[PDB]
XYZ file of N, CA and C in Angstrom:
480
model
N -70.472 101.521 70.941
C -71.227 101.044 69.770
C -72.594 100.518 70.156
N -73.631 100.881 69.399
C -74.999 100.368 69.594
C -75.178 99.060 68.824
N -75.602 97.984 69.483
C -75.858 96.683 68.855
C -77.268 96.177 69.191
N -78.181 96.153 68.222
C -79.506 95.530 68.380
C -79.480 94.069 67.917
N -80.207 93.201 68.621
C -80.452 91.808 68.244
C -81.901 91.420 68.548
N -82.622 90.911 67.548
C -84.018 90.480 67.673
C -84.170 88.957 67.518
N -85.175 88.377 68.166
C -85.565 86.969 68.100
C -87.086 86.801 68.181
N -87.579 85.702 67.618
C -88.901 85.145 67.913
C -88.771 83.773 68.577
N -89.590 83.525 69.598
C -89.613 82.289 70.354
C -91.059 81.826 70.508
N -91.303 80.537 70.320
C -92.676 80.017 70.404
C -93.000 79.667 71.856
N -94.198 80.055 72.291
C -94.765 79.710 73.598
C -96.095 78.961 73.474
N -96.360 77.982 74.342
C -97.704 77.381 74.502
C -98.704 78.318 75.207
N -98.253 79.467 75.723
C -99.075 80.461 76.433
C -99.741 81.424 75.424
N -101.057 81.717 75.507
C -101.757 82.666 74.623
C -101.177 84.101 74.620
N -101.305 84.899 73.534
C -100.502 86.120 73.345
C -100.697 87.217 74.402
N -101.934 87.473 74.836
C -102.212 88.441 75.896
C -101.750 87.927 77.270
N -101.799 86.611 77.518
C -101.348 85.974 78.775
C -99.822 85.877 78.871
N -99.141 85.669 77.741
C -97.688 85.805 77.588
C -97.262 87.221 78.007
N -97.869 88.245 77.398
C -97.664 89.651 77.758
C -97.940 89.914 79.250
N -99.177 89.655 79.693
C -99.706 89.918 81.042
C -98.834 89.316 82.143
N -98.329 88.096 81.953
C -97.438 87.437 82.918
C -96.125 88.198 83.137
N -95.494 88.698 82.067
C -94.185 89.348 82.156
C -94.279 90.807 82.615
N -95.462 91.422 82.525
C -95.700 92.773 83.047
C -96.287 92.779 84.466
N -97.356 92.025 84.742
C -98.103 92.106 86.008
C -97.519 91.292 87.183
N -96.732 90.243 86.913
C -96.317 89.253 87.926
C -94.814 88.912 87.936
N -93.993 89.506 87.061
C -92.608 89.082 86.806
C -91.740 88.924 88.068
N -91.939 89.804 89.049
C -91.237 89.807 90.338
C -91.391 88.475 91.094
N -92.583 87.877 91.022
C -92.907 86.554 91.558
C -92.660 85.452 90.519
N -92.915 85.733 89.238
C -92.787 84.776 88.141
C -91.362 84.217 88.035
N -90.338 85.054 88.203
C -88.927 84.648 88.143
C -88.608 83.502 89.136
N -88.808 83.651 90.464
C -88.614 82.550 91.412
C -89.732 81.493 91.405
N -90.955 81.778 90.924
C -91.974 80.738 90.659
C -91.425 79.698 89.677
N -90.938 80.158 88.521
C -90.627 79.283 87.382
C -89.234 78.660 87.453
N -88.258 79.305 88.103
C -86.863 78.849 88.142
C -86.144 79.165 89.485
N -86.629 78.634 90.629
C -86.178 79.018 91.974
C -84.709 78.722 92.319
N -84.030 77.787 91.644
C -82.580 77.602 91.810
C -81.785 78.552 90.909
N -82.293 78.841 89.708
C -81.627 79.741 88.766
C -81.723 81.221 89.175
N -82.768 81.602 89.918
C -82.961 82.941 90.473
C -83.450 82.881 91.923
N -82.874 83.719 92.786
C -83.318 83.865 94.178
C -84.651 84.616 94.243
N -84.855 85.629 93.393
C -86.126 86.346 93.277
C -86.049 87.629 92.459
N -87.096 88.444 92.561
C -87.118 89.794 92.019
C -88.042 90.710 92.844
N -87.718 92.000 92.920
C -88.352 92.941 93.855
C -88.615 94.305 93.210
N -89.810 94.858 93.431
C -90.148 96.216 93.019
C -89.383 97.255 93.866
N -88.499 98.034 93.238
C -87.807 99.173 93.856
C -88.406 100.540 93.505
N -89.201 100.639 92.439
C -89.767 101.906 91.960
C -91.051 101.672 91.152
N -91.896 102.696 91.014
C -93.126 102.661 90.218
C -94.226 101.775 90.811
N -95.153 101.319 89.964
C -96.376 100.586 90.339
C -96.610 99.298 89.508
N -95.572 98.820 88.821
C -95.623 97.780 87.788
C -95.729 98.341 86.363
N -96.208 99.579 86.200
C -96.283 100.299 84.927
C -94.935 100.892 84.477
N -94.918 101.750 83.439
C -93.719 102.499 83.043
C -93.124 103.312 84.202
N -91.808 103.509 84.197
C -91.060 104.078 85.321
C -90.902 103.125 86.515
N -91.251 101.842 86.379
C -91.000 100.820 87.413
C -89.545 100.361 87.395
N -88.985 99.952 88.538
C -87.669 99.289 88.601
C -87.804 97.949 89.323
N -87.300 96.880 88.699
C -87.230 95.519 89.249
C -85.783 95.180 89.596
N -85.457 94.935 90.867
C -84.168 94.334 91.249
C -84.269 92.815 91.134
N -83.718 92.252 90.062
C -83.732 90.815 89.739
C -82.441 90.175 90.257
N -82.525 89.016 90.914
C -81.408 88.473 91.706
C -81.245 86.961 91.543
N -79.995 86.503 91.537
C -79.606 85.096 91.426
C -78.330 84.813 92.226
N -78.010 83.540 92.442
C -76.807 83.114 93.160
C -76.254 81.773 92.643
N -77.147 80.821 92.340
C -76.936 79.574 91.582
C -75.518 78.977 91.711
N -75.192 78.482 92.909
C -73.822 78.330 93.422
C -73.499 79.299 94.575
N -74.520 79.919 95.176
C -74.457 80.860 96.311
C -73.649 82.155 96.099
N -73.075 82.403 94.921
C -72.375 83.653 94.583
C -73.383 84.703 94.091
N -73.884 85.557 94.989
C -75.004 86.458 94.698
C -74.690 87.495 93.603
N -75.623 87.646 92.663
C -75.569 88.503 91.476
C -76.905 89.213 91.280
N -76.837 90.454 90.811
C -77.980 91.366 90.750
C -78.108 92.042 89.383
N -79.331 92.413 89.024
C -79.662 93.341 87.943
C -80.688 94.341 88.478
N -80.736 95.559 87.933
C -81.939 96.391 88.025
C -82.438 96.693 86.619
N -83.671 96.264 86.383
C -84.377 96.420 85.124
C -85.385 97.541 85.309
N -85.172 98.675 84.641
C -86.166 99.747 84.607
C -87.168 99.435 83.514
N -88.433 99.237 83.862
C -89.562 99.209 82.930
C -89.768 100.620 82.404
N -89.395 100.842 81.153
C -89.432 102.161 80.532
C -90.800 102.465 79.903
N -91.475 101.436 79.383
C -92.745 101.531 78.652
C -93.545 100.221 78.759
N -94.863 100.332 78.952
C -95.826 99.230 78.832
C -96.986 99.748 77.987
N -97.324 99.005 76.943
C -98.270 99.381 75.900
C -99.287 98.254 75.695
N -100.426 98.357 76.380
C -101.510 97.367 76.306
C -102.247 97.337 74.956
N -102.128 98.354 74.095
C -102.735 98.323 72.758
C -101.932 97.411 71.821
N -100.612 97.606 71.771
C -99.701 96.752 71.004
C -99.341 95.435 71.716
N -99.640 95.317 73.016
C -99.049 94.325 73.926
C -97.511 94.302 73.780
N -96.915 95.493 73.938
C -95.470 95.760 73.901
C -94.971 96.196 75.287
N -93.776 95.756 75.661
C -93.196 95.899 76.996
C -91.692 96.140 76.896
N -91.274 97.333 77.299
C -89.926 97.842 77.124
C -89.288 98.127 78.483
N -88.058 97.665 78.660
C -87.239 97.886 79.857
C -85.760 98.053 79.474
N -84.824 98.382 80.379
C -83.432 98.220 80.061
C -82.700 97.837 81.320
N -81.507 97.292 81.116
C -80.464 97.499 82.105
C -80.277 99.022 82.150
N -80.798 99.619 83.223
C -80.148 100.725 83.925
C -79.056 100.160 84.835
N -79.102 98.843 85.096
C -78.019 98.159 85.853
C -77.975 96.627 85.729
N -76.751 96.101 85.662
C -76.410 94.682 85.686
C -74.908 94.462 85.868
N -74.312 94.998 86.938
C -72.882 94.848 87.236
C -71.977 95.350 86.097
N -71.146 94.490 85.470
C -70.305 94.847 84.318
C -71.024 95.511 83.135
N -72.350 95.358 83.020
C -73.155 96.042 81.999
C -73.326 97.555 82.234
N -72.822 98.066 83.357
C -72.527 99.476 83.602
C -71.057 99.877 83.439
N -70.122 98.924 83.361
C -68.670 99.180 83.410
C -68.019 99.251 82.029
N -68.470 98.436 81.071
C -67.942 98.401 79.687
C -69.029 98.266 78.624
N -70.184 97.709 78.984
C -71.456 98.179 78.443
C -72.012 99.326 79.296
N -72.995 100.029 78.742
C -73.704 101.137 79.404
C -75.206 100.885 79.629
N -75.869 100.113 78.759
C -77.335 99.958 78.707
C -77.698 98.710 77.893
N -78.850 98.075 78.146
C -79.365 96.994 77.277
C -80.833 97.303 76.992
N -81.239 97.735 75.791
C -82.630 98.178 75.582
C -83.505 97.039 75.076
N -84.437 96.596 75.913
C -85.342 95.489 75.633
C -86.687 95.942 75.079
N -87.309 95.086 74.269
C -88.691 95.228 73.834
C -89.270 93.826 73.624
N -90.138 93.398 74.541
C -90.980 92.213 74.399
C -92.260 92.656 73.691
N -92.544 92.039 72.551
C -93.782 92.191 71.774
C -94.431 90.817 71.582
N -95.722 90.669 71.874
C -96.434 89.421 71.549
C -96.834 89.370 70.066
N -97.105 88.161 69.584
C -97.803 87.876 68.339
C -98.542 86.529 68.445
N -99.467 86.266 67.528
C -100.145 84.981 67.437
C -99.200 83.840 67.029
N -99.453 82.653 67.572
C -99.004 81.395 66.994
C -99.846 81.049 65.752
N -99.293 80.381 64.725
C -100.044 80.053 63.512
C -101.198 79.071 63.776
N -101.055 78.199 64.781
C -102.086 77.276 65.285
C -103.153 77.966 66.156
N -102.958 79.236 66.524
C -103.896 80.016 67.338
C -104.104 79.522 68.777
N -103.256 78.627 69.300
C -103.362 78.092 70.661
C -102.572 78.947 71.648
N -101.250 78.798 71.601
C -100.273 79.613 72.316
C -99.966 80.930 71.595
N -98.698 81.337 71.581
C -98.228 82.604 71.007
C -96.827 82.505 70.402
N -96.436 83.544 69.668
C -95.034 83.848 69.398
C -94.632 85.014 70.305
N -93.624 84.799 71.146
C -92.908 85.870 71.820
C -91.910 86.493 70.836
N -91.984 87.797 70.568
C -90.951 88.548 69.833
C -90.154 89.392 70.827
N -88.828 89.397 70.722
C -87.955 90.111 71.662
C -86.758 90.764 70.973
N -86.623 92.080 71.128
C -85.376 92.810 70.861
C -84.579 92.937 72.159
N -83.254 92.796 72.087
C -82.308 93.190 73.129
C -81.191 94.003 72.473
N -80.955 95.230 72.951
C -80.060 96.203 72.307
C -78.908 96.612 73.214
N -77.773 95.985 72.982
C -76.526 96.073 73.714
C -75.794 97.378 73.378
N -75.729 98.325 74.315
C -74.969 99.559 74.138
C -73.597 99.398 74.795
N -72.531 99.407 73.998
C -71.142 99.284 74.469
C -70.495 100.658 74.668
N -69.614 100.781 75.667
C -68.843 102.002 75.945
C -67.671 102.140 74.974
N -67.484 103.343 74.433
C -66.453 103.642 73.442
C -66.590 102.811 72.163
N -65.446 102.479 71.559
C -65.349 101.678 70.333
C -65.493 100.153 70.547
N -65.872 99.681 71.740
C -65.922 98.252 72.059
C -66.938 97.487 71.185
N -66.510 96.426 70.496
C -67.427 95.517 69.793
C -68.121 94.583 70.792
N -69.358 94.156 70.510
C -70.092 93.246 71.401
C -69.600 91.801 71.239
N -69.406 91.108 72.357
C -69.063 89.685 72.390
C -70.256 88.808 72.003
N -70.045 87.813 71.138
C -71.045 86.779 70.854
C -71.450 86.020 72.125
N -70.500 85.750 73.024
C -70.793 85.135 74.320
C -71.637 86.048 75.235
N -71.537 87.378 75.125
C -72.415 88.316 75.848
C -73.825 88.384 75.229
N -73.924 88.375 73.893
C -75.199 88.260 73.160
C -75.942 86.971 73.555
N -75.213 85.857 73.673
C -75.714 84.567 74.161
C -76.124 84.621 75.637
N -75.316 85.221 76.516
C -75.645 85.378 77.940
C -76.953 86.150 78.165
N -77.191 87.188 77.358
C -78.441 87.939 77.369
C -79.619 87.058 76.960
N -79.531 86.372 75.810
C -80.611 85.486 75.340
C -80.916 84.371 76.332
N -79.900 83.669 76.822
C -80.097 82.443 77.598
C -80.850 82.656 78.915
N -80.654 83.765 79.643
C -81.449 84.022 80.863
C -82.926 84.279 80.544
N -83.214 85.045 79.489
C -84.581 85.286 79.027
C -85.240 83.993 78.508
N -84.590 83.287 77.579
C -85.035 81.998 77.048
C -85.163 80.910 78.130
N -84.337 80.970 79.178
C -84.435 80.125 80.366
C -85.779 80.318 81.059
N -86.097 81.564 81.428
C -87.382 81.945 82.022
C -88.575 81.653 81.097
N -88.452 81.887 79.786
C -89.529 81.644 78.817
C -89.893 80.156 78.703
N -88.909 79.252 78.611
C -89.181 77.802 78.639
C -89.615 77.317 80.026
N -89.101 77.930 81.092
C -89.468 77.598 82.463
C -90.916 77.989 82.811
N -91.449 79.114 82.310
C -92.845 79.509 82.588
C -93.854 78.557 81.950
N -93.575 78.007 80.766
C -94.410 76.945 80.185
C -94.408 75.692 81.070
N -93.222 75.215 81.465
C -93.094 74.036 82.316
C -93.800 74.229 83.672
N -93.703 75.426 84.256
C -94.414 75.820 85.472
C -95.936 75.818 85.275
N -96.418 76.452 84.204
C -97.836 76.587 83.869
C -98.514 75.236 83.592
N -97.761 74.260 83.077
C -98.199 72.873 82.900
C -98.061 72.011 84.173
N -97.232 72.405 85.147
C -97.051 71.711 86.429
C -98.017 72.208 87.520
N -98.405 73.486 87.473
C -99.260 74.155 88.458
C -100.474 74.870 87.804
N -101.337 74.183 87.016
C -102.262 74.842 86.082
C -103.353 75.738 86.685
N -103.583 75.702 88.000
C -104.600 76.515 88.687
C -104.368 78.043 88.640
N -103.227 78.518 88.129
C -103.019 79.942 87.812
C -103.748 80.344 86.523
N -104.475 81.465 86.551
C -105.108 82.057 85.362
C -104.188 83.025 84.599
N -103.002 83.334 85.139
C -102.036 84.307 84.604
C -102.630 85.714 84.466
């Protein structure tokens, strides 16, 4: 079964800089912003553009866990950024794929931004999606999104 879920999240980061950070620097941004929650991330394929693969990694209790996120599309006109689980352990075993789309928008105050995000859970066979799996997907992304603001306010000499 195909299951799409969309959210908007507010950021203190400006809309093009919100976009630019998650496309140009994410491999370093993950352990920059949350070094106990993630061990790091590494380029396995491409050049940071479409057809890129990021091996994203955590242990958080020393039990090592991995994802591979294929960057499928990057669109600088829309400031849209699309990737999926081509891999995330059990997300290949009873799920098959997770189709992401990060889209920026303006904040109403014009200071920071609104992050818009789709995550699309593809389940194997007739399997219904777990609410706890929908939550597990959101919480790692929302973890990094709140952590990059806290990082950017703690270490402001980055231009992003």
